[PDB]
Amino acid sequence: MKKDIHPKYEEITASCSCGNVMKIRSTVGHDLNLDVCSKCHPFFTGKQRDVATGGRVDRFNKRFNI
Amino acid sequence: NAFLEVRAGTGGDEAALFAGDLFRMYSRYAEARRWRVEIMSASEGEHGGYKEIIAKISGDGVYGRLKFESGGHRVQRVPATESQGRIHTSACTVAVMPELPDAELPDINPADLRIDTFRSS
Amino acid sequence: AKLHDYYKDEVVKKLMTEFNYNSVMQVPRVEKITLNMGVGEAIADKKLLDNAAADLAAISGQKPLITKARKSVAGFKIRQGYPIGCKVTLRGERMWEFFERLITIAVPRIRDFRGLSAKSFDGRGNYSMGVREQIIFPEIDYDKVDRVRGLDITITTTAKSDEEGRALLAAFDFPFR
Amino acid sequence: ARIAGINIPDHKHAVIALTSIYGVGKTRSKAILAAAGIAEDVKISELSEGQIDTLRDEVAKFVVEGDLRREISMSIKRLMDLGCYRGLRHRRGLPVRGQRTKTNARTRKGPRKP
Amino acid sequence: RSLKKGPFIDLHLLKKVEKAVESGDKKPLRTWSRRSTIFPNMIGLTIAVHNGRQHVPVFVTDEMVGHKLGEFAPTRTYR
Amino acid sequence: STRRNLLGSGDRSDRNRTYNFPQGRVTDHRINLTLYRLDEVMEGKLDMLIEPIIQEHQAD
RNA sequence: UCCUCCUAAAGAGUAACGGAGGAGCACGAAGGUUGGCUAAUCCUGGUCGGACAUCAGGAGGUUAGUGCAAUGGCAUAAGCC
RNA sequence: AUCUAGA
RNA sequence: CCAGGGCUACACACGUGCUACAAUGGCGCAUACAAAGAGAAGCGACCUCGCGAGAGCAAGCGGACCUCAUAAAGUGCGUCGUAGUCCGGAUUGGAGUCUGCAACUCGACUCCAUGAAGUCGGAAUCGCUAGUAAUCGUGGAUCAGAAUGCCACGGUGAAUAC
RNA sequence: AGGCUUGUAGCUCAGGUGGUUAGAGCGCACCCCUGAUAAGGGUGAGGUCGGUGGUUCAAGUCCACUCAGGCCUACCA
């Protein structure tokens, strides 16, 4: 890099509520709060629920019952 | 194809207002059989309708379906411009002229042309 | 950084087991990342690209170049030499750290998220995606800014074709629906 | 304060602030703050993260900002593909619920342009 | 939105479906019943519902189940 | 030359139809038709008007 | 009046109210020197972004550029910084 | 400013 | 005579209205103060269940006694601080409940999500002189269901006329 | 025949010189005034700038090419 034209690149500490700390280098400022990350996020259960939504005859069966 | 052309007759305001309502009648007829109707010219009346409205109708055998409407059309009603409420009798007149396309107006054939070259004066 | 130190041992070996290279230098390795932001609306608002470049300086690490119209076009009212889009070709250590900060805290914060696509390969082994907003990066307050501004990350890898480059990123557990 | 997409209020009381999420209005917000147990007239400025973690999973129970758009659009796109009455109304932008269409309907049928 | 106890049909439609179970396939079964819901066992059939002047034949499918028949026979014909 | 022959004199001496709104009646003078329609004429639907004239025109 | 091509017949020159086009300037840098660089146009992928803005790669190899008319040239570059 | 033509 | 459809269609125009554009307001809680009516192949307590429309058993009453029927604007206390917003409620998606043989065209009503046009309105334009205008709720006829209309009733309650 | 000059909204004209943006009067459509029309008042749409091809980053404009209209010249014999 060059000098005195680039911004700061302080190594700060990350934090999500999940319990997954990985300290990383940027110019956020002081601290890093998160709620989701590469883990503790529905990348693998939210990519399962959006597909299966159809199905209608068993709805009609949930109103006769006999 | 044909030229449907409705001129208003006696009763120059009321039958203008009625020639509006013959033009809407064949207008409603040509749309039924899917024919193109197009108002080529329209002299409007005073209180609605037209003193003459010449409108080309193209389509599929327009002339043989509509050649019988040429003539007068006498209209017994209470008018719109009638403040005493009695019957008035008017008339509209329609013509229907056929398509009749064009051919080349001169035949410039110089074998018909006697060319007479003489001295100038 | 840390997934470069995961690269050099487990992703190199992770691909040496898969596409059975008789050499090692035949493994792909990600060359660079070129964050573009083609702001465009510097023709009408000249001081827009000040902050539109100041965004890339805070998203990425370093100071951006502000690039110019190659040949002038009258479809968009730009004369040749007009500053129309700011870019950063980061490489080296900062590319592993921006990529590591990409798949950890930047990818999962995308609103209405499906998973990144896999057809975003150019048929060469180079992945190129586009992001809509700024706020998948924590450096943006969401309160300090006012613009709907977004960029489009271009991952450049030295693979021969994209059958290989999809394996290189998917060995980094890259999303790929 | 980033639940289910964005959620950025400013000095607004908590039940009014949680309305901002697509998929919860006034009632379901009181179901959140009833279940997750936060007082109603506290503010998301005051509401610290050790309180919010009880809400990022609590609004996550009912379908919210993300998955509800493709729930709803999935049902609409279903109706258009049926070719029933109502999908034949969604194709055109005429009112589905049997309104007047002679005179009114400028919500469903757009502005009064022609 | 309708009739919480008993999804509604008519006997002249329903027994016609019952005979359409063992009849195999048929030409469209001329029914004027619109107020009846479609039972799930009618899939594969092609009953024709009266819109008011003509019977439009409609193929009962897994998507088109709990809806009534008159959903799928538009009466008024516009432009 | 032809339009003058077809477009009549304009005056009300009956020339090839009437349109009688108080009685509701329509009479085309030829094939002295006596249709009482006048709402089935004033939106097209003069099929019954024209058709006996073309029949009694293919009569000759 | 002047410049460029063709007529002009493989040196030069060569007419016509022969065929085609430009000039009556610009530039203190668009001059010098050193150092660096290489296009046009398509295809693939990509935020609004679009056939046509910026990005990355590939094809292509001067079809580009040359302050302005045409010819002659020009990568050692005379083109770009 | 004008308001045709059927007591 | 019969079944299905239609009178509810929708490029648009006109008439009357209802809800609004908000802070003399919205929302949450506590609370006060009426008139006029209707009721038996009717009104329907009480108690329970349901988030809510409502569902179960059901006392009374052809009624100054029983039922609809908690009147609301009001007052007190918070709250939101001028934002297309805790304004506004269309439009839509899903699940409901009633009546009726039947709720698709085409019923009303509830719950949850939805949250658009709209920031007092051009030229013109209408009603209104006092318990009037304005505003607030309630009842009846028609009627199985189905009014923002009609017909009636009370609450608060003005400025103005030279 | 050449020489000079028009062509822009449905009509009549600016806009063209000065290359990056299309306006005016009347007409037309919609709503008021009116017993109803005209007048009037309020609101609105309406153009690829005669067709063809170059230059240019871009053509309504700038150069050729025409097409339809107009004026002038066409003499000495």
Swiss-Prot record, chain A:
Q: List the Pfam families.
A: Ribosomal_L31
- Which GO BP terms, alphabetically? cytoplasmic translation; negative regulation of cytoplasmic translational initiation; translation; translational initiation
Task: State the post-translational modifications.
Answer: Proteolytically cleaved by protease VII to yield a peptide lacking residues 63-70. It is not clear if this is due to protein degradation or is a bona fide processing event in the strain used in PubMed:339950 and PubMed:10556732. In strains B, D10, MRE-600 and Q13 the only protein seen in PubMed:10556732 was full-length; the last 7 amino acids were sequenced only for strain MRE-600.
> Sites of the modification N6-acetyllysine?
8
Q: Which GO terms describe its molecular function?
A: rRNA binding; structural constituent of ribosome; zinc ion binding
Q: Read off the InterPro entries from this record.
A: Ribosomal_bL28/bL31-like_sf (IPR034704), Ribosomal_bL31 (IPR002150), Ribosomal_bL31_A (IPR027491), Ribosomal_bL31_sf (IPR042105)
The record's free-text note on cofactor binding: Binds 1 zinc ion per subunit. Only 1 ligand appears to be Cys, the other are thought to be His and either backbone amides or solvent.
Note the effect listed for residue 18 to S.
Binds Zn(2+) normally
The protein's required cofactor(s) are namely:
Zn(2+)
Where on this chain does Zn(2+) bind? 16
Query: Per its UniProt record, what SUPFAM superfamilies does this chain match?
Result: L28p-like
Q: Which Gene3D superfamilies match?
A: Ribosomal protein L31
Q: How is this protein organized at the quaternary level?
A: Part of the 50S ribosomal subunit.
Q: Which HAMAP family match?
A: Ribosomal_bL31_1
- Under what name is this protein listed? Large ribosomal subunit protein bL31
Organism equals Escherichia coli (strain K12)
UniProtKB/Swiss-Prot annotation, chain B:
Localization, per the record, is: Cytoplasm
Question: Which Gene Ontology terms cover its molecular function?
Answer: ribosome binding; translation release factor activity, codon specific
Example GO biological process: translational termination
Q: Could you list this entry's UniProt keywords, alphabetically sorted.
A: Cytoplasm, Methylation, Protein biosynthesis
A cellular component annotation (GO) from this entry: cytosol
Main location class: cytoplasm
Fill in the PTM field for this protein. Answer: Methylated by PrmC. Methylation increases the termination efficiency of RF1.
Q: Which domain of life is it from?
A: Bacteria
What biological function has been recorded for the protein in this entry? Peptide chain release factor 1 directs the termination of translation in response to the peptide chain termination codons UAG and UAA.
Give the family from UniProt: Belongs to the prokaryotic/mitochondrial release factor family.
The protein's name:
Peptide chain release factor RF1
* Originating species: Escherichia coli (strain K12)
At the highest ranks, the source species' classification is: Bacteria, Pseudomonadati, Pseudomonadota, Gammaproteobacteria, Enterobacterales
Counting on the full-length protein, the chain here runs from 110 to 230 of 360
Swiss-Prot record, chain C:
Pfam families reported in the protein's UniProt record: Ribosomal_L5 (PF00281), Ribosomal_L5_C (PF00673)
Question: The organism sits in which domain of life?
Answer: Bacteria
Cite a GO CC annotation.
cytosolic large ribosomal subunit
Q: Which Cys-Cys disulfides exist here?
A: none
The cross-references to PROSITE patterns, in alphabetical order and at most eight, read: RIBOSOMAL_L5 (PS00358)
Q: Which residues carry this modification: N6-acetyllysine?
A: 2
Give the record's keywords alphabetically.
Answer: Acetylation, Ribonucleoprotein, Ribosomal protein, RNA-binding, rRNA-binding, tRNA-binding
The protein's matches in InterPro entries, at most eight in alphabetical order, are given as: Ribosomal_uL5, Ribosomal_uL5_bac-type, Ribosomal_uL5_C, Ribosomal_uL5_CS, Ribosomal_uL5_dom_sf, Ribosomal_uL5_N
Which function does this protein serve?
This is one of the proteins that bind and probably mediate the attachment of the 5S RNA into the large ribosomal subunit, where it forms part of the central protuberance. Its 5S rRNA binding is significantly enhanced in the presence of L18.
> Whom does it interact with, and what assembly results?
Part of the 50S ribosomal subunit; part of the 5S rRNA/L5/L18/L25 subcomplex. Contacts the 5S rRNA; cross-links to the P site tRNA. Forms a bridge to the 30S subunit in the 70S ribosome, contacting protein S13 and S19.
Q: What else is known?
A: Identified as a multicopy suppressor of the slow growth phenotype of an rsgA (yjeQ) deletion mutant.
Q: What family is this?
A: Belongs to the universal ribosomal protein uL5 family.
Q: What is this protein called?
A: Large ribosomal subunit protein uL5
User: Encoded by which gene?
Assistant: rplE
UniProtKB/Swiss-Prot annotation, chain E:
Gene Ontology molecular-function annotations = rRNA binding; structural constituent of ribosome; tRNA binding
Where do the coiled-coil regions begin and end?
none
A Pfam family hit: Ribosomal_S19
Q: Which PROSITE patterns does the UniProt entry name for this protein?
A: RIBOSOMAL_S19 (PS00323)
Keyword Ribosomal protein tagged: yes
What SUPFAM superfamilies does UniProt report for this protein, alphabetically?
A: Ribosomal protein S19
User: What does the protein in this record do?
Assistant: In the E.coli 70S ribosome in the initiation state it has been modeled to contact the 23S rRNA of the 50S subunit forming part of bridge B1a; this bridge is broken in the model with bound EF-G. The 23S rRNA contact site in bridge B1a is modeled to differ in different ribosomal states, contacting alternately S13 or S19. In the 3.5 angstroms resolved ribosome structures the contacts between L5, S13 and S19 bridge B1b are different, confirming the dynamic nature of this interaction. Bridge B1a is not visible in the crystallized ribosomes due to 23S rRNA disorder.
The entry describes its oligomerization and partners as:
Part of the 30S ribosomal subunit. Binds S13 and L5 and cross-links to the A site tRNA.
Q: Which NCBIfam families match?
A: rpsS_bact
What family is it from? Belongs to the universal ribosomal protein uS19 family.
The UniProt entry, under PANTHER family, shows: RIBOSOMAL PROTEIN S19P FAMILY MEMBER (PTHR11880), SMALL RIBOSOMAL SUBUNIT PROTEIN US19M (PTHR11880:SF8)
Protein name, entry field: Small ribosomal subunit protein uS19
Q: Which organism is it from?
A: Escherichia coli (strain K12)
Q: Which gene encodes it?
A: rpsS
